Amino acid sequence: VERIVSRDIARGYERIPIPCVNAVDSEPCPSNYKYVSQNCVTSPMNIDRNITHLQYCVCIDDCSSSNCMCGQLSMRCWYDKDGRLLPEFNMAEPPLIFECNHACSCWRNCRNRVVQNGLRARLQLYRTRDMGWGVRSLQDIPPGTFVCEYVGELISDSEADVREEDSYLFDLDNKDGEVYCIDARFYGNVSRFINHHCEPNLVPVRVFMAHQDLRFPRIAFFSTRLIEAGEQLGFDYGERFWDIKGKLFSCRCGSPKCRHS
């Protein structure tokens, strides 16, 4: 019925493959970018990797207790036993998540470890009728689930201001006011292909793992509700994006509450 134009765009780099299918036109699997499973740089970011600067926990358990320092950094550890965000998690103004790290006394299978375990959902790159390429889930995803990370090239504020191919930028704005950006234009993972939706089934959360340099949160998408098998993924690109692109095209997310139609 369709055309399986790839068995895995990640070439085996993700825990689970991410095929590409096109059921709509003759466009072959996208190849104008380099798939990378983790953030890269093409120009020094002086990410603070000094291991003695990490805050870490000394838990003698599985990091379920109120005493876990890494949990305290996050407000509380928001993950349940299955790895899902607690119902009480604020998806409107998500807190910063600090996962346990290699400086912690705890074990690798501790509770406070989710994003760092990589992809667990079966996803698929497919051709949409209205929006170019998009990503859909191939199975039921429960709410509060880690789905994928927004991966690309870490660049500076001012370098980002000169990028002419600007449809793949993700701004990292510190609470301190400092700003960097992830550009998935040339180097990126499956998240570069996730389209905007006005009623999103995904929310991005800033997460820290092997480093705690606050200029460089890593961006994790968690489901905000049950996503059904076959359902396209989407998050809210936000207002800064639309104030600019809205001059060139309109949102075709198709929602009856579409805010950018």
Binding site: D161, D166, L169, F170, D171, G238, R240, F241, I244
Partner: peptide, 9 residues
């Protein structure tokens, strides 16, 4: 100028 078309919101 304009500005930059970054996510999110």
């Amino acid at each position: 100028t304009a500005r930059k078309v970054g996510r999110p919101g």
